[PDB]
């Protein structure tokens, strides 16, 4: 009863404190920065070999190997430069909605409607890929996976909860809660000490990996959040939603800096990623396109017109030499 | 590919493609059907040839030179809107309804409206199953079909009641190009697969008519 009033007034204090800091908009400070021009990027590779639709993709740390997960129950590891197929791993469950490549390149992870985050070992003595561990404990589908080291993985489920695992033992070291809806994505901070997660309840929150506590929560979206990624310097992140808009939040400021909505855009975002410098914000919509946004001025700097169906994943190499996109038409295209 | 090793790497790539292509062929004659409905609605015993195999449960019975896969998504306990797009390519949606559960009837109706009107399933035919005729026939005598449907006006006879319940389910179509193959089944009904098989034939013929340009 009274606590409800205490909850309401607490929100007001945060809103009041949030408003006091706001002095000038991002577009108002950077209005005299010269534009970036028209970014023309032409397809360089066309990785084909998938039969069904493609639902996830991740770049290796060395910017050459790829991993893509499709609905046909195959997990392929591509050689970007030569378009060769290094590996092709059969999956127990054909329903997959994520895939992750370990930083060291020794492991690769997968998951989906089976509520199990499988980990495969690639540098095996026997020369074939084997399932080292099967992580269970989530009561709903699995949305995103990310490696912290060779013995630690952070996962996001539709149970409204994320977790931090210990691959060796197989248990769930720390569990994060606080969301009121399905968690649809997450991204790890560059220093791997914080990470953010956007849920279907139209809000993203920042989490302390070591401590297991929610340090912040961000609002502003009118609908569910489909993708999220950190700014390269680790002090801001951008979110994509079904509202047909992307937004840029700043952790230190604890607010929303800019919006990337356009009158001509009607469908929802499916993926988001930044470039190495952090000046281009690439998002893939359901109109069969990916739009490049000038992250500092909210100007469409170009379009990556390709694919015959929805774009389901995006990726930017750690060296920043290329961009890869996957779509339901069962083709990955590397754009340079 | 000039180098000696890089040549051997290229073989491995071609050998992998061969297995990916061949597995597609071996997995081309399988028809994917989605199972839906309320609980205790017979969604687990539609066909007695189960051969099953928390999460997603699959059943892969085969019949008449065709491989049928039924996917049961019960137990997700999540918001359908986010995993429904996974089954966008299923041939048909197999819906189950229990005529003996008046209280659950409205829940079933609500589900049908959303499934039939979902933007992804704007083109997938629905194979409607109405289960437990005998229990329906026995229960109607003791409790008239008015408590669940106060708007009902026809007689209290079996044929009219079963006909009316079907119409309500069909009344949620509200769209063309999508057809519903309603059927009535009992507990002791062996020929359930035959009904799926024939109805699947008509759905496929409808698609090829779209692809070939005749429509």
């Amino acid at each position: 009863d009274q606590l409800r009033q205490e909850a309401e007034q607490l929100k007001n204090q945060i809103r009041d404190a949030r408003k006091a800091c706001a002095d000038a908009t991002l577009s108002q400070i950077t209005n005299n920065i010269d534009p970036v021009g028209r970014i023309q990027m032409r397809t360089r590779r066309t990785l084909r070999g998938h039969l069904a639709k493609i639902y996830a993709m991740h770049w290796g740390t060395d910017s050459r190997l790829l991993v893509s997960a499709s609905q046909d129950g195959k997990l392929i590891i591509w050689d970007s430069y030569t378009t060769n197929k290094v590996h092709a791993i059969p999956l127990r469950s054909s329903w997959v909605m994520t895939c992750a490549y370990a930083p060291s390149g020794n492991y690769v992870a997968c998951g989906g409607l089976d509520n199990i985050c499988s980990i495969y070992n690639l540098k095996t003595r026997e020369g074939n890929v084997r399932v080292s561990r099967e992580l269970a404990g989530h009561t709903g589908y699995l949305s995103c996976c990310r490696f912290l080291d060779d013995n630690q993985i952070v996962t996001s489920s539709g149970d409204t909860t994320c977790a931090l695992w210990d691959i060796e033992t197989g248990q769930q070291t720390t569990t994060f809660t606080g969301h009121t809806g399905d968690v649809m994505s997450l991204s790890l901070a560059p220093d791997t000490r914080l990470f953010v997660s956007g849920a279907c309840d139209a809000s993203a929150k920042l989490w302390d990996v070591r401590e297991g506590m929610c340090r912040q929560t961000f609002t502003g979206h009118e609908s569910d959040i489909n993708a999220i990624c950190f700014f390269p310097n680790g002090n801001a992140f951008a979110t994509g939603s079904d509202d047909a808009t992307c937004r840029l939040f700043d952790l230190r400021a604890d607010q929303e800096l800019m919006t990337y909505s356009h009158d001509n855009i009607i469908c929802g975002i499916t993926s988001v990623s930044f470039s190495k410098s952090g000046r281009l914000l690439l998002a893939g919509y359901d109109d069969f396109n990916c739009n490049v946004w000038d992250a500092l001025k909210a100007d469409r700097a170009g379009v990556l017109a390709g694919h015959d169906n929805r774009v389901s994943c995006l990726g930017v190499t750690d060296d920043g030499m290329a961009v890869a996109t996957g779509s339901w038409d069962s083709f990955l295209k590397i754009w340079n | 590919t000039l180098s000696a090793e890089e040549r051997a790497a290229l073989e491995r790539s071609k050998a992998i493609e061969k297995n990916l292509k061949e597995d597609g062929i071996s997995a081309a004659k399988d028809v994917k059907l989605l199972l839906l409905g309320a609980d205790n609605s017979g969604k687990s015993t539609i066909v007695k040839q189960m051969k099953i195999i928390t999460g997603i449960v699959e059943t892969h019975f085969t019949f008449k030179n065709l491989h049928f896969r039924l996917f049961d998504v019960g137990g997700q306990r999540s918001e359908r809107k986010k995993w429904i797009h996974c089954f966008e390519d299923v041939t048909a949606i197999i819906f189950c309804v229990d005529l003996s559960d008046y209280n659950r009837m409205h829940e079933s109706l609500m589900l049908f409206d959303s499934i039939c009107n979902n933007k992804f399933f704007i083109d997938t035919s629905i194979i409607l199953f109405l289960n437990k005729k005998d229990l329906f026939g026995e229960k109607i005598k003791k409790s008239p079909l008015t408590i669940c449907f106060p708007e009902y006006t026809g007689p209290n006879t079996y044929e009219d009641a079963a006909a009316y319940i079907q119409a309500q389910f069909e009344s949620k179509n509200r769209s063309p190009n999508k057809e519903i193959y309603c059927h009535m089944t009992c507990a002791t009904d062996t020929n359930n697969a035959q009904v799926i098989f024939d109805a699947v034939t008509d759905i496929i013929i409808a698609n090829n008519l779209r692809g070939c340009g005749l429509y």
């Epitope: 050459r64 190997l65 050689d79 030569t82 060769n84 290094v86 590996h87 390149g105 003595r125 026997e126 020369g127 074939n128 | 000039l2 180098s3 000696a4 090793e5 890089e6 051997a8 790497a9 073989e11 491995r12 050998a15």
Partner: single-chain antibody, 233 residues
Framework: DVQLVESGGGLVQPGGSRKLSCSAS????????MHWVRQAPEKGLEWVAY????????YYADTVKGRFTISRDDPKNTLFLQMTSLRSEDTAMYYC??????????????WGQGTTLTVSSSDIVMTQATSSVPVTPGESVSISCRSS???????????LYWFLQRPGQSPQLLIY???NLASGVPDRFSGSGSGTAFTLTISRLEAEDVGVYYC?????????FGAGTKLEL
């Protein structure tokens, strides 16, 4: 554990024929290219034949073309070498070696234990200048070997391999392209080079490192080994 065992050698009369069998157990034999490598009595390794995965490719060294034929039996997990007419030059110990080729692979990691064969009585040339190098434990050592062409390729990968043969055992891989340490070896080993001159350097020499070192090129067939350098304690 991975294991390759060979059999079928012995004493044969000149012009006779024999069949050597190499039976694998402990890995996905169907996915590995298998080599045959022979070592005449205290002379040095010499490549013989190679059959790829799926038997799609086959090669032979000029010394044995036509007389030797190589075959693989995938379902049985076995490798066969059929020798038709044997001269007195073919007496040697034959090794069964495995190789898997893909981006970032280690294509000679394991060697068989080998079988003894006795017979009763254009190419890149790699040279190892020094034949012996006495040394005591704890002293830095260096081993170098030259080449005819520049092994450096357009890809940027220098195709050179360093093998270590201990007394009485089969060789063991150390460095597979120019500087990558093969899995299982101590980090003390290192390798470097440029184009046509290469060197292997050892720090904190141990008592188990005494043996013979062979430098091999994999740029293009036929594969060629160096004469070999011996370390004496």
């Amino acid at each position: 554990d991975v294991q390759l065992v060979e059999s079928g050698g012995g004493l044969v009369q000149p012009g006779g024929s024999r069949k050597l069998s190499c039976s694998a157990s402990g890995f996905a034999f169907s996915s590995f290219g298998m080599h045959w490598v022979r070592q005449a009595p205290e002379k040095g390794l010499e490549w013989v034949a190679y059959i790829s995965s799926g038997s799609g490719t086959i090669y032979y060294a000029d010394t044995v073309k036509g007389r030797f034929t190589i075959s693989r039996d995938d379902p049985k997990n076995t490798l066969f070498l059929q020798m038709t007419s044997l001269r007195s030059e073919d007496t040697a110990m034959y090794y069964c070696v495995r190789s898997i080729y893909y981006y970032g692979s280690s294509p000679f990691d394991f060697w068989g234990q080998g079988t003894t064969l006795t017979v009763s009585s254009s190419d890149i040339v790699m040279t190892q200048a020094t034949s012996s190098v006495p040394v005591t434990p704890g002293e830095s050592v260096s081993i170098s070997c030259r080449s005819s062409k520049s092994l450096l390729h357009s890809n940027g990968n220098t195709y050179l391999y360093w093998f270590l043969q201990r007394p009485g055992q089969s060789p063991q891989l150390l460095i597979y392209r120019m500087s990558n340490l093969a899995s299982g070896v101590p980090d003390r080993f290192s390798g470097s080079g440029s184009g046509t001159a290469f060197t292997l350097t050892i720090s904190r020499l141990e008592a188990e490192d005494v043996g013979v070192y062979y430098c091999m090129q994999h740029l293009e067939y036929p594969l060629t080994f160096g004469a070999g350098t011996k370390l004496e304690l």
